[model samples]
Target: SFVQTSGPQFTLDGKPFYFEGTNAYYLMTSDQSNVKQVFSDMKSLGLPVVRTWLFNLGSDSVWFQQWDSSSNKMVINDNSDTGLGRIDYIIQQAASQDIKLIFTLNNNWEDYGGMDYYVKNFGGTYHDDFYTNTEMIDSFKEYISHVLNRENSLTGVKYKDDPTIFGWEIANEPRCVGSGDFPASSNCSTTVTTAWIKEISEYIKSIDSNHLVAVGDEGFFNRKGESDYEYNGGSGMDFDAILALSSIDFGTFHLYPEAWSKGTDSSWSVQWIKDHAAAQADADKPVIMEEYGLSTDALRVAQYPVWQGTVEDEDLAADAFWQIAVPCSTMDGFGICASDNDIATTVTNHADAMAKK
Candidate 1:
């Protein structure tokens, strides 16, 4: 039987769930097998949460084709056949496995502005006036209308009332493409980004009242380097956005250990953890470290120093990656990172060590 999870904020059995997750790409597309091994492992290890991206760029392209920017119009295309569109079913399976999900509703802004055609020309043409134009309100409304309005579907989810949902992430990362720089005069400014987040957050609250909301913001202060906006994977573009709208229940941040300043001792991130946690505690909320992971290669250092390089023995690096993350999460509160099917073993071996403390 599926273990019933508690409120959206805690573990299934109320064991101070330290969320351990990964950006599992396949879940947005596949049905049973996507997280088969990883999910199983997570459950076994007592890992209670999984974070996945809901808006697959390649998939959204086909679904959002009718989203015309010129006329500032978007037609609700209920075509969930983009191969990667079986997200509801995926969520059901996760719920069945007794897993709490932190869903990132959208992804890479450049892709949102449009794909190949728009990106080729520097995120133009494939415009996503969704935020600045009427498109934003409508697109968001439609998305929520069917997906989150709740009644009963594949999982009989009473969405707004269902406490199963962990939180509604605003979007993946907004106004964060062109790594090193953006259009010196582009309209997707910090003001634009923050406005959209606030606008959407409010709209979601208007409909769904049970679940808490979060921003899948990439405002990772300890960024690897000013490597350039191109590699921020659409992050680190707007400082003003952070200052203006530092709101949200639990602050969400993604960290590529290799890309963060916490490259040296895994324990060092402890301080950054306390800092963010203290900030949130000051606001009277539990802090959720939404995303954290290691790329597992030398390439990570080129951008950030936290990578667990293979220069050491394979086993050593593997053990170290977990060592760096698991204990870190213990002192930091609940957090999850990219996990595979056999996640329980990994999390128990890695994160749970210090969690019991």
Candidate 2:
């Protein structure tokens, strides 16, 4: 069933739905068996929702969209083995397990040929042009339409009508400046990105009303005079403004204190949760701390509950850890593997607690 919002709460079939979820960006590219293992791990952990990348652009091995120089136009590769067929299998598997998915349509970074890919391919000179250039915008709109309308090869359900999808995130951590030290135009600002979000999210709503849509930002505040970069609007995200948009169904934020240089302690993250919860209250929409983690299991074991406690107290609708890793996966710095007993216990306990709420 589709997840709905009711003034700061997520409702599934007319009941408040609060969950503990996790992110796994590689599910669409992993081997089918590995994907099954990951889903098994999530089910074991009681994780009902997962956020993953839906895009794999400009890759010869696996890609959903690529530029065809022969035709001088972009093309979609929906081949069952190499392209969106992987996503087809993922959705089918998740549905069997009753796991809802939040698919991010693009990346802000260069990991999977993100905004800079569009900028360079479409003759855009600046990273921010992906948000403002006519060709880039139109191309992105086309991609959105194609993806939302795709029929699942396995289940015969159109993507828009599938109830297994929990939501669609416009991008993963969108910023004015992307990776590789890409340049932003002099006029790029939070308003520019927010306007782009407004347009794209509204466009998605026009096509599919069964799923929710969010900005997939790091929940940066646009406070005019703040010294912290996160709160100073440097990331080209205004959490409140994005949430207030009529077409945006919910709010999303990420926390990586060490990466953001906001201190390596839980204090900053705790308050960050509270502040976004405050924004949720003001906007009367559900807010999720969609991604958060520490670099080591020890730190996470020591601190995750402190931050999650704040989430419970603030009544934030949901929180997903940065990642949940299973066997046969390269352990990224932020991943919470199954052997990390303390962290796993913390997550299991938290998941149980949130489910009760």
What would the per-residue lDDT of candidate 2 be over residues 145-175, giving only the tens digit for each residue? 9999999999999999999999999999998
- Identify the candidate with maximal lDDT: 2
Deviation (Å) of 64 in candidate 1: 7.3
Candidate 1 lDDT, tens digit per residue, 189-308? 445666767777778777766676767665444234544342332443442234234345455544444455556446544444444444443444444545544443223223222222
Off by over 4 Å in 2: 328-330
* Residue-level error in angstroms, candidate 2, position 329: 4.8
Give TM per candidate. Answer: 0.64, 0.97
**Alpha-carbon local distance difference test for all models:** 0.46, 0.88
What TM-score would candidate 2 get against the native? 0.97
Candidate 1 regions exceeding 4 Å error are 1-18, 57-85, 109-130, 150-152, 176-189, 221-247, 260-271, 297-346, 350-357
